[PDB]
Write a protein that binds this ligand. Sequence first.
Ligand SMILES: CC(C)CCC[C@@H](C)[C@H]1CC[C@H]2[C@@H]3CC=C4C[C@@H](O)CC[C@]4(C)[C@H]3CC[C@]12C
Ligand SMILES: CC(C)CCC[C@@H](C)[C@H]1CC[C@H]2[C@@H]3CC=C4C[C@@H](O)CC[C@]4(C)[C@H]3CC[C@]12C
Ligand SMILES: CC(C)CCC[C@@H](C)[C@H]1CC[C@H]2[C@@H]3CC=C4C[C@@H](O)CC[C@]4(C)[C@H]3CC[C@]12C
Ligand SMILES: CC(C)CCC[C@@H](C)[C@H]1CC[C@H]2[C@@H]3CC=C4C[C@@H](O)CC[C@]4(C)[C@H]3CC[C@]12C
Ligand SMILES: CC(C)CCC[C@@H](C)[C@H]1CC[C@H]2[C@@H]3CC=C4C[C@@H](O)CC[C@]4(C)[C@H]3CC[C@]12C
Length: 1422
Amino acid sequence: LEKFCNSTFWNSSFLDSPEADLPLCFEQTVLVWIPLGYLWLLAPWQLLHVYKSRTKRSSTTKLYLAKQVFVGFLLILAAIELALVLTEDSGQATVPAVRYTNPSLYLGTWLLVLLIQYSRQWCVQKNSWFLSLFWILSILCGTFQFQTLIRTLLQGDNSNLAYSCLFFISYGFQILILIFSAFSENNESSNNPSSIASFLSSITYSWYDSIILKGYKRPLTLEDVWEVDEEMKTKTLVSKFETHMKRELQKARRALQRRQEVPKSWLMKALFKTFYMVLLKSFLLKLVNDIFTFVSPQLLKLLISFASDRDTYLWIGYLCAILLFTAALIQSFCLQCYFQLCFKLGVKVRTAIMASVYKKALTLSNLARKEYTVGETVNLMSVDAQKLMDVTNFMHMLWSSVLQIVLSIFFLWRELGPSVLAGVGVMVLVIPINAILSTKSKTIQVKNMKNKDKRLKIMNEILSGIKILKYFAWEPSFRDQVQNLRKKELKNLLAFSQLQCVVIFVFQLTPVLVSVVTFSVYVLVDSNNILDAQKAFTSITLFNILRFPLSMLPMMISSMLQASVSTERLEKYLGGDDLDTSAIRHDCNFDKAMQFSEASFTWEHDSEATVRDVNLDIMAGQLVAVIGPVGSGKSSLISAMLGEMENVHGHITIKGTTAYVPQQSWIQNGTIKDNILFGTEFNEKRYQQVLEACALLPDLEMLPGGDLAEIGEKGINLSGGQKQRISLARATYQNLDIYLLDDPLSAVDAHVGKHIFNKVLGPNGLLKGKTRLLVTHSMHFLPQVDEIVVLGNGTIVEKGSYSALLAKKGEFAKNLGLISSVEEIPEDAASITMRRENSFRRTLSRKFSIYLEYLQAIGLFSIFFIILAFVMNSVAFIGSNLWLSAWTSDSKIFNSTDYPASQRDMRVGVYGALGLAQGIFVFIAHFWSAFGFVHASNILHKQLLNNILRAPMRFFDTTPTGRIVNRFAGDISTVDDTLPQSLRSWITCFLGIISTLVMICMATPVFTIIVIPLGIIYVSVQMFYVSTSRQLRRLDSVTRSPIYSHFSETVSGLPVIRAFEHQQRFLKHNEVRIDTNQKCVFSWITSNRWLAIRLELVGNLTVFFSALMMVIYRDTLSGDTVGFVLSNALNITQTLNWLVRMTSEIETNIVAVERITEYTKVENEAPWVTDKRPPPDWPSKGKIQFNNYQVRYRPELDLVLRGITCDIGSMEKIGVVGRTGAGKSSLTNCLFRILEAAGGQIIIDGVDIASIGLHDLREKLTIIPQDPILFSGSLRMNLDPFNNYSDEEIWKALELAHLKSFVASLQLGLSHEVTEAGGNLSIGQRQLLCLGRALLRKSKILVLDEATAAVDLETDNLIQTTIQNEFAHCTVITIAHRLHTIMDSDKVMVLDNGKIIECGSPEELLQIPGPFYFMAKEAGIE
Ligand SMILES: CC(C)CCC[C@@H](C)[C@H]1CC[C@H]2[C@@H]3CC=C4C[C@@H](O)CC[C@]4(C)[C@H]3CC[C@]12C
Ligand SMILES: CC(C)CCC[C@@H](C)[C@H]1CC[C@H]2[C@@H]3CC=C4C[C@@H](O)CC[C@]4(C)[C@H]3CC[C@]12C
Ligand SMILES: CC(C)CCC[C@@H](C)[C@H]1CC[C@H]2[C@@H]3CC=C4C[C@@H](O)CC[C@]4(C)[C@H]3CC[C@]12C
Ligand SMILES: CC(C)CCC[C@@H](C)[C@H]1CC[C@H]2[C@@H]3CC=C4C[C@@H](O)CC[C@]4(C)[C@H]3CC[C@]12C
Ligand SMILES: CC(C)CCC[C@@H](C)[C@H]1CC[C@H]2[C@@H]3CC=C4C[C@@H](O)CC[C@]4(C)[C@H]3CC[C@]12C
């Protein structure tokens, strides 16, 4: 190279000076060879890759011509430079070839740049990574030439000016070209801008931000979320996975058959063989990032060394700061891309498993299907697949730990020595302790869950039946009855809370402990050891680096253990056998549409044949009926026709299609029209005919929505009579060839059955040509059939026509969130794991004022002290660092053989004391925090319960029960579980950040300036993220439940699905429903990565400046002062991301307190007890009177009852009777003050009901409930919750009620338990018991109602007479509809539309014609 060039390649004199620079020999050689090599070496492929995939050229845009003209300018500039150089010196001038090759080289390269750019015009991504990286390499290499050239000229030499000006122009044009090579230049494809995006946009995610702007202004819906790429569409992933699954299983089955004469491991392989490439790429990226994790500490040590002494050069510090900035930037850019790749792979695996499970479900054999449960398979897809997604989101950790740890350990020893082991051991002993406490926490949480479940069950009953409680005034008892359970749960909650505090304490103080032990052991083990700043601060940095893997490796091992059993379970279902179909021949026999050649089928595998030796044939257009006894096997025969049984001997010939009407009707979710259509083009000449013939017209008219009324699990639940007619209508509208009806006229009555038979299926009906096979139990329609068969014991006994069988004279005669892994937020490694586990376990079972309110519930007195403790801990932290910074500074004064013992002891005793103080203050803060919450949950729930239990009926009527009960279950769980964890983590993160900034600003009072700008950027970048992520969190939940709903529906109705041959439609529906959720998950997976690049950039900028500010003031700075500032600021990048993410969860979770508060402040009704007390034995006589009583249910609604003036005498029986909508039932709800008194008043015993207190009036009144309701518990609780009576008087009551026979001979006496609404008891005694309930009170005024409607005749009679025999010295008012029953009333009151009309004796009312007489004439009682 010496003869090629003219100057020396490298000499110490070039450097080793205040001013130092590489010569124009090293810079004009290697620095102009690296950039060219990258372009030349890796061009061919980047042309082969374009050559094979050449498509249509894209329209030309201004950017293209600009990029082409700038390169042309470069070309002409290089050409003119070469010409000038050649012309300058030709004769007697041995010009070095550095002036010949370099010019020519560039001229050669620019040509390739022009060509490669044109070729890109024929691909999707125009600006790829190749050129974008080339330009950066060129600029970085050419900055050095620019650095020296300028100096040479500035120094004062004028020898070379053309070259400098030429080089300067080129360097600029290069800058401009790089700037132009970043614009997206989009084709504006509505699918997604991810495919069309330059390198820089696709590496800083500056294309998602459009959505960030769209969601900030207005709420965003499913329309404006970009669709997923084709490579991820469900249809594509399945095929790819299916190929390898099919290829593997067969080999696994062969291996299992060859040996041991149910596969063992195939799923895991099928996944690796399908997705190895993404694994390889992610592994490479993770390996590259793993390197930067240990690069920083070396630059930090270099900074400490440079700042320690004084006789150095500034360039060293400036270069080190620039290198630190660049390393941080590169590490962040690589890490984000690795995260994106891994999470995308996880989503792909989850979709490819869920869709494949769904596709198998509808082709599995009957045996395996009957082995499983309907909910079990849904839980299988909803739980197993999700578990596999997690173990594929964090697998690379396994290898990225055993390596990281090793590397870290190596650095430590080279830095300190064997003392390091002391720290590691203390950092290893923590994990064992952590386990003993997790097991205890789980043990407590199990009983917590059990007691919580017991509490909610009583809540549901009282909320649903709030009417009966109000009538009998039983509210006070349930208060304490539920408060007992509340306290019993609260004690366990407090125990669990204080246990969780010990765990956070050990994970919180471990950094200081390891530091005190390591430093003390190192300095005290040998007198020769001297502590210096570089070693100490670098050791701290490596300890902080190593602290994570040793704490995530335990978690990863536990997760893989769960995924093992999850995989094992799925492989049984996805590898199950298929039903056999080599028994039904779909041939066009034509001679017959059915043939049985001595068939014999069995339900089980090899058990007894349910159908044995059956042989029959029926021609087309023949209606034949199959009859027999119970358990004969008809439905088994029709299922064998469908082919749902295992063949044993014989074959069945079927011509044409088939239609099925199952005995147990199956109804989907949706409108009635959708169910009737069942995937068919809508018509008008047939739809109307079907609905009318099936007599589904009158009922449809009565439905609230008519034809478009939502039916199914989440809608009107129809009865057997209707659901059967809907199924029959669907079957008859689909219009197939062969109909197999299984008892379709059982739920309907005689009229509807006759109409359907004469209009739909029969001699003259819709299906008059198609063959019909009907199974029946009624002999009413037998004469109108063609042939009948009598099945017996699974075989045919007699087959013949109606007349023939009757003539045969035999048997017939008698017969007729937002978190994906624990690597993204490593500090909160535990809480995240617990939340996942809790959610998985819970799946199986199934204006700043609110912050002030929650703090007031907690208690501000304790809040002040807790904040004081946390703040004091931060001060003790900064204090310890300054003591070390002083301790490390101490070394320069002394030497190896001058260190005294007193200094050695003093420099460590104080360090130990400060560590102890830090530990104590944290422990105290955590100790109080736990209690400060258990009290909050108690006051919030108790306060809420008393208020909600006292609300008037309006509120209970307007709001659905579901909303009210959810607050008592979900919110209370949220307010006492995750809430405290986040509320206690956020303050720790904020105080850590604040403490770090005080330290840097203290050392450099100048730093205070940068704080303001960063804050404005931080709080700005912050609002944006939350303003969008919150909305996407909701969309995801709304677009998930559908999938599991669909799977449950198809699994339940498989035979009907497979009888109609309608599987492709359902597969397509499932594929669409999966692609809707797969589109929404990615939209938040990308957003999290957007925030990171922005915040990691901010966090790296705030440390770059600090470093530079300590090089311009280094004259006044020591080596240690440049240690505590950088050693801490090095970990401020990720803490910002953690704070934003954690403050985006606390904000979403505070919604719980808000809801609870609204119901705690619901309007209340009149006070229960007032000072006005009634005279003793107030209801002495039954004297009621109404003075123009007028009332309205709600203020916005009009008066329902008006102008009421009647008199009620003592010991008088009154019958209230009227028309519909006359307010008869309102009269009762007016005597118990359930409503108010818009006009008039009610006076009883001379005392207006208003004056008497609420709970003081109801006690002395009795009413028989309209719908007898029985609460859970024991028989004593239903009869007397208040345990006021004794058993003796109770035992008399059942004797009067004719129920002592049942209760005396029961399993127990009065202590027998009852299930829900008395489910254990039968209907007969449920209505009877409520009679006895009211009997015990033996009040004076009894308000009866029409509640004997479902009471059986004999029982009814008993009830009627019982009333007369027992209630004689009392006043009885009865609202009834049995006009006949109303005959003995002393006065009969008549209501028309809310006005008293006739008041007289029934004999007088009938003697004189009138509205009552007209009603009796219509009724015909007399
Ligand atoms: C790794 C690089 C890129 C960044 C780190 C800073 C580099 C440029 C610095 C740090 C320490 C420096 C060395 C320190 C001491 C000497 C001895 C002297 O007689 C010749 C220069 C030499 C050998 C220096 C060369 C430049 C150097 C290696
Ligand atoms: C666009 C970027 C990449 C250019 C980077 C190089 C710049 C920042 C550097 C490289 C060489 C530097 C020059 C080197 C020497 C001198 C002479 C001195 O008496 C004043 C400063 C001055 C004039 C420096 C100014 C800044 C400078 C021009
Ligand atoms: C590594 C890449 C990314 C950045 C390169 C930055 C280079 C061009 C910069 C960084 C620090 C700079 C040096 C800082 C200080 C001095 C002392 C001055 O009297 C002469 C110039 C000199 C010696 C500079 C030369 C150019 C320099 C080395
Ligand atoms: C070049 C880009 C990429 C990085 C930025 C580097 C900056 C911080 C560097 C590059 C050139 C440097 C300057 C080069 C020369 C001098 C003259 C000297 O008497 C004081 C320092 C001073 C003024 C330096 C300050 C720091 C400096 C401006
Ligand atoms: C140990 C516990 C009791 C500490 C309590 C700390 C209090 C003061 C903290 C915890 C949660 C915090 C809130 C969390 C989120 C936000 C949203 C942000 O846009 C404005 C500040 C605001 C509204 C915070 C205000 C201060 C806050 C209420």
